[PDB]
Amino acid sequence: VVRLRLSRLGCKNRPFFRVMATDSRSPRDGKHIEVLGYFNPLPGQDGGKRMGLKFDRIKYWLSVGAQASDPVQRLLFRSGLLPPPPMVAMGRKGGERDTRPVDPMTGRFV
Amino acid sequence: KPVIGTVVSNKMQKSVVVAVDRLFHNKLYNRYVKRTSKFMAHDETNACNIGDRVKLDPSRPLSKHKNWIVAEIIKKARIYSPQAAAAAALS
Amino acid sequence: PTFNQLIRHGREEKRRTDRTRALDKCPQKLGACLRVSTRTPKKPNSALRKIAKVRLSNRHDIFAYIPGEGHNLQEHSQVLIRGGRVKDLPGVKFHCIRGVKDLMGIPGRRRGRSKYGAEKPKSI
Amino acid sequence: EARLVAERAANEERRRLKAEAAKVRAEERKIFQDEFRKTLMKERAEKL
RNA sequence: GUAAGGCGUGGGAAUCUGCCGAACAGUUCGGGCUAAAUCCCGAAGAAAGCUAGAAAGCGCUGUUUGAUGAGCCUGCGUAGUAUUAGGUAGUUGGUUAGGUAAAGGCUGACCAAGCCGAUGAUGCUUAGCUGGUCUUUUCGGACGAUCAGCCACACCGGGACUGAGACACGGCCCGGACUCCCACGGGGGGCAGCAGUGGGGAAUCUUGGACAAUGGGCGCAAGCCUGAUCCAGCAAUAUUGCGUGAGUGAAGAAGGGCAAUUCCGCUCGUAAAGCUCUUUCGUCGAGUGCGCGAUCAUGACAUGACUCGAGGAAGAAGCCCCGGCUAACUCCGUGCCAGCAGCCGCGGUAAAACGGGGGGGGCAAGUGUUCUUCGGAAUGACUAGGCGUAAAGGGCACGUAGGCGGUUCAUCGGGUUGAAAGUGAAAGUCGUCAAAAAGUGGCGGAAUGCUUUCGAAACCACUGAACUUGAGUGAGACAGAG
RNA sequence: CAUAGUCAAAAGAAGAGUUUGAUUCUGGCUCAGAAGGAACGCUAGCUAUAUGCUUAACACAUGCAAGUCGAACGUUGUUCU
Ligand SMILES: [K+]
Ligand SMILES: [K+]
Ligand SMILES: [K+]
Ligand SMILES: [K+]
Ligand SMILES: [K+]
Ligand SMILES: [K+]
Ligand SMILES: [K+]
Ligand SMILES: [Mg+2]
Ligand SMILES: [Mg+2]
Ligand SMILES: [Mg+2]
Ligand SMILES: [Mg+2]
Ligand SMILES: [Mg+2]
Ligand SMILES: [Mg+2]
Ligand SMILES: [Mg+2]
Ligand SMILES: [Mg+2]
Ligand SMILES: [Mg+2]
Ligand SMILES: [Mg+2]
Ligand SMILES: [Mg+2]
Ligand SMILES: [Mg+2]
Ligand SMILES: [Mg+2]
Ligand SMILES: [Mg+2]
Ligand SMILES: [Mg+2]
Ligand SMILES: [Mg+2]
Ligand SMILES: [Mg+2]
Ligand SMILES: [Mg+2]
Ligand SMILES: [Mg+2]
Ligand SMILES: [Mg+2]
Ligand SMILES: [Mg+2]
Ligand SMILES: [Mg+2]
Ligand SMILES: [Mg+2]
Ligand SMILES: [Mg+2]
Ligand SMILES: [Mg+2]
Ligand SMILES: [Mg+2]
Ligand SMILES: [Mg+2]
Ligand SMILES: [Mg+2]
Ligand SMILES: [Mg+2]
Ligand SMILES: [Mg+2]
Ligand SMILES: [Mg+2]
Ligand SMILES: [Mg+2]
Ligand SMILES: [Mg+2]
Ligand SMILES: [Mg+2]
Ligand SMILES: [Mg+2]
Ligand SMILES: [Mg+2]
Ligand SMILES: [Mg+2]
């Protein structure tokens, strides 16, 4: 089965991901059919995360029956190319979060 | 592309061997070197003489070394027959 | 040559003999001393240079020089052998390394003393 | 397919224009070759 | 192991393809394994049922398809050696049967004598190939270790079975060597998986933690597996990193070295000590944690990081060298000895060259030495060299292959050339920005190539008609120890 | 209008010592540069990221590296109501 999955790039303790179209039997960072985009799991200066996708190629691979992995299902819902995964209906776990403000430039308590 | 060569052997049954020339570019010394391949081709009627210029088509494997089929004889080789030549002299 | 000649018959390389064939492209080789002796230099030099006949671990027999002043080598002492000839002595193409295995360092040496296995003198 | 048929139409015009130019050049060639042949025939007769 | 059944690159036809996507049709009846079945057999047409706990949800079968893989073939490119010249006999081809999912001498039989080779077959030696790594004004040379793609192998040989897929590293059968048990009849094993141990060697690590992330198997899920991986441990092995303080300080202290023993006699030296300031890195003590990697939830790392506090310049500088090449000089000792040495060379009583003191120079958590590669080396010269006297014109020809070689006009479109399309994996090199502070990524460029289509027609090749300047003939004159 | 527009894809070319009484030439040897899966000496504070049996495809102690599904199927036997 063709799979839309995540290949690990970056370095140790600095993860970066590429979105790949692969045969399922292939090694994780080895052989692939196509690079489809990227995803940055670390939050940047803008307060959010980054992602790029080749929308037409992802539509091609989904049209011929490729199966997205568990993080790629979330990433493709978030970009609007797939419906929401079934577990996002459960809502978030609550609890008292520490909302004491920290300075953006210095990281100390305001 | 189109594969054209000269018949160098025809003594097999339904088979010829065809010599095809090509130019190899020696990149270090900037010259063009003639190289020859000998290809075995199917010739059902056994019509090709040695020295004929033929065109070959690709084919599925027909035998162990036969992968081509003779399609067209472009130029026929000249064969010296002494008695036909003597009859031409008598005319 | 012409370009056609170079196509037919290219260019070969220069032929140069190996300097230390017995080291077998290793940086060092362990050995055991067979005979410890002296040898006189080629003229115009004159001395008594302390050498050692060493059988290497790859069963090669070499002559190695013992550098510095004074040594403790005997027959059947383990020596680590590095490359580098001694120009006074033909046929001696190697050196013994001071301060490793049986060949001791030279205490009292003060300058250039890591080439002679000598430690740094502790200040008191 | 639209680009292919437009390209074929342009090539069909270019081919006919070149054919007409080739025909008029070949018609111009024959008078020169006949005169040149007459000149060479005269020279061979003189040498004979 | 393999020198072409491999690999790189581009194509092809005579094939198969579990799981995955999308249509259609079915899913009936008997028997067998102590008991049953989605196990096995039989009949039709192929099958197989489970679930009202998963009842219109899964699953299976047949037929059409997409997608992904696999098998097969092929053009071109891809070592050394001629002090290896012939090699082949299912060999090369044909016919007919068999075998295969599938072309095929794949092989049985019959027939022919072919096929390969001086454009280097065969023999011998070495070698996995590629992307790439190091070096280098482009080219080349060496390498092919990490990582990724392809191939080969799994103690050594030989086999097949099951399966969509294997002739299968941790499957089976057989033979062999080695080895461990044995109650002595006989059994068992295969770290070139991750750790680890002997051994060899100059030399190369922990018998670690977690499946939190990513990827994979099974399962409807819940989950369960995963030495893939992720992350810790050891090692200056590498890396344009950071730190070892910042100022001030003249009793120019003591002490060391040198000195007509010159100017505080010169110098170590503002150097130290002392005094003031700041505490990066490391140390110590605490505190929050949906800070972040991960989210619906789940954190091994984490005894970390972050933030705050304590403290005190405190815990942190060597190695090589100083005759020339090559930046940096004096004293003492030694006396062709002891020794030094990359090269040239030093040492035989005033040694800047050996060894120690003192001073100084270069690099700096390194710095030397050995090995190895490229450069300098235009020192195998394509870029870019030569052969009168220095290495080097064959004693001289004739001729095979090969290489090279006049003119015009016409045709053509193989090379050449222009554009378009496909391909040229990722990583790496180059450009640029952002990120980061010894760490990353995106977009480009490059990948000089190959295939297809359509233009051009000068050149090369090919075809046709011609030309006479190069070559060769004839006629007429000659010369000659040919 | 504009999350537009800008057309970048390199840099990299060094010489010295040594044959002679001296010279120029030919021609080797050696040196200054960069580098490695390196090894050894002396000497070492820190963080991070890489890399770490090149030799014996030598022999291997020990633990782990491939299982999962009761939603395919019976079977026996445990508890309790
Ligand atoms: K020495
Ligand atoms: K490949
Ligand atoms: K084998
Ligand atoms: K996991
Ligand atoms: K070192
Ligand atoms: K200090
Ligand atoms: K000739
Ligand atoms: Mg074949
Ligand atoms: Mg050969
Ligand atoms: Mg090998
Ligand atoms: Mg190679
Ligand atoms: Mg073994
Ligand atoms: Mg199976
Ligand atoms: Mg089968
Ligand atoms: Mg095993
Ligand atoms: Mg191991
Ligand atoms: Mg050992
Ligand atoms: Mg998973
Ligand atoms: Mg599933
Ligand atoms: Mg592990
Ligand atoms: Mg550094
Ligand atoms: Mg700190
Ligand atoms: Mg702490
Ligand atoms: Mg968190
Ligand atoms: Mg740590
Ligand atoms: Mg100087
Ligand atoms: Mg003296
Ligand atoms: Mg010196
Ligand atoms: Mg000295
Ligand atoms: Mg060169
Ligand atoms: Mg050069
Ligand atoms: Mg030249
Ligand atoms: Mg020369
Ligand atoms: Mg000449
Ligand atoms: Mg001559
Ligand atoms: Mg001669
Ligand atoms: Mg013309
Ligand atoms: Mg053309
Ligand atoms: Mg690329
Ligand atoms: Mg990058
Ligand atoms: Mg970049
Ligand atoms: Mg001389
Ligand atoms: Mg290895
Ligand atoms: Mg089972």
What DSSP character marks residue B4? Answer: E
Element (H, E) at D13: helix D2-47
AA identity, residue C13: E
Cα distance between residue A18 and residue A75, in whole Å: 12
- Asked whether strand F has any atom less than 7 Å from the CB of A13, the reply is yes
Cα distance between residue C23 and residue C35, in whole Å: 19
Instruction: Name all contacts of C90-94 with Cβ < 8 Å and 24+ positions apart.
Output: C90/C42, C91/C63, C92/C39, C92/C49, C92/C51, C92/C63, C92/C64, C92/C65, C93/C19, C93/C20, C93/C22, C93/C62, C93/C63, C94/C20, C94/C22, C94/C23, C94/C54, C94/C62, C94/C63, C94/C64, C94/C65
- Strand F bases contacted by the protein (CB, 7 Å): 28-29, 38-44, 48-50
What's the distance, CA D30 to chain centroid?
9
Tokens of C13: 């390389």
User: Are the CB atoms for C67 and C95 separated by under 8 Å?
Assistant: yes
State, as a whole number of angstroms, the distance between the CA of D22 and the C1' of E15.
53
Strand-pair category, A2-11 with A14-23:
antiparallel
Test the B interface: residue of C3, C4, C5, C7 with most B CBs within 10 Å: C7
Instruction: Name all contacts of A67-73 with Cβ < 8 Å and 24+ positions apart.
Output: A67/A1, A67/A2, A67/A3, A67/A4, A68/A3, A68/A4, A68/A5, A69/A3, A69/A4, A69/A5, A69/A6, A71/A6, A72/A4, A72/A5, A72/A6, A72/A19
Q: For residues C73-84, b (16+ Cβ closer than 10 Å) or e, as one string? A: beeebebbbbbe
Residue A40 neighbours by CB under 8 Å, 6+ apart: A16, A17, A49, A50, A51
Classify A25 in phi/psi space as left (phi over 0), alpha (psi -120 to 50) or beta. Answer: alpha
C-beta atoms surrounding B68 within 10 Å = 22
- Smallest CA-to-CA distance from B33 within C12, C1, C10, C8 is with C8
Cα distance between residue A58 and residue A4, in whole Å: 8
**In what side-by-side order are the strands of the sheet with A50-53?**
A50-53, A34-40, A14-23, A2-11, A67-68
User: Are the CB atoms for A29 and A7 separated by under 8 Å?
Assistant: yes
User: Are the CB atoms for C100 and C80 separated by under 8 Å?
Assistant: yes
Radius of gyration for chain B, computed over Cα atoms and rounded to the nearest angstrom: 17
3-class DSSP assignment, residue D27: helix
- Asked whether strand E has any atom less than 7 Å from the CB of B89, the reply is no
User: Measured CA to C1', what is the nucleotide nearest C14?
Assistant: E380
By CB atoms closer than 10 A (0-12, 13-18, 19+), residue B9 is middle
- Strand E bases contacted by the protein (CB, 7 Å): 12-14, 18-22, 66-69, 73-77, 92-95, 103-106, 112-117, 119, 139-140, 147-150, 200-203, 213-217, 228-232, 288-298, 306-308, 318-322, 336-348, 355-357, 367-372, 379-382, 385-386, 402-404, 409-412, 414-415, 425-426, 435-436, 439-443, 448, 451-452, 454-457, 466-468
What's the distance, CA D1 to chain centroid?
35
Phi, psi dihedrals of residue D24, rounded to the nearest 5° = -70, -35
Q: CA angle, corner C115, sides to C51 and C52, nearest 5? A: 10
C-beta atoms surrounding D4 within 10 Å = 8
3-class DSSP assignment, residue D31: helix
State which approach was used to obtain the coordinates: cryo-EM
Sign of CA dihedral A10, A11, A12, A14: negative
Point out the ligand nearest to the CA of residue A12.
25
Count of CA atoms in the C-beta half-sphere (13 A) of A5? 19
Residue B79 neighbours by CB under 8 Å, 6+ apart: B49
C-beta atoms surrounding C118 within 10 Å = 20
- Smallest CA-to-CA distance from B68 within B82, B78, B77, B57 is with B57
CB contact under 8 A, C4 and B31: yes
DSSP string, chain A: -EEEEEEEEEETTEEEEEEEEEETTS-TTS--SEEEEEEE-S--TTSS-EEEE-HHHHHHHHHTT-EE-HHHHHHHHHTTSSPPPGGGGG-----------B-TTT-SB-
Spell out which residues of chain B touch residue C4, defining contact as CB-CB under 8 Å. 31
Cα distance between residue A51 and residue A17, in whole Å: 9
Contacting C with CB below 8 Å, chain B residues are 26, 29-31, 33
Radius of gyration for chain D, computed over Cα atoms and rounded to the nearest angstrom: 21
Task: Provide the terminal-to-terminal Cα distance of chain A, rounded to the nearest Å.
Answer: 53
Cα distance between residue C52 and residue C97, in whole Å: 12
User: Are the CB atoms for C84 and C60 separated by under 8 Å?
Assistant: no
AA identity, residue C9: H
3-class DSSP assignment, residue D41: helix
Residue C51 neighbours by CB under 8 Å, 6+ apart: C36, C37, C38, C39, C63, C64, C65, C66, C89, C92
What DSSP character marks residue C21? Answer: G
User: Measured CA to C1', what is the nucleotide nearest A74?
Assistant: E295
3-class DSSP assignment, residue B54: strand
Sign of CA dihedral C94, C95, C101, C103: positive
Size of interface B-C (CB pairs under 8 A): 9
Cα distance between residue A60 and residue D20, in whole Å: 51
Cα distance between residue C99 and residue B38, in whole Å: 69
Kindly give the distance from the C-alpha atom of residue C77 to the centroid of ligand 17, in angstroms, as a whole number.
Answer: 16
Q: CA angle, corner C50, sides to C47 and C56, nearest 5? A: 145
AA identity, residue C92: V
Give how far B13 is from chain C: nearest CA, Å: 38
Cα distance between residue C54 and residue C31, in whole Å: 6
Spell out which residues of chain B touch residue C6, defining contact as CB-CB under 8 Å. 29
Q: What is the resolution of this structure in A?
A: 2.1
User: Measured CA to C1', what is the nucleotide nearest C119?
Assistant: F42
Cα distance between residue A110 and residue B58, in whole Å: 80
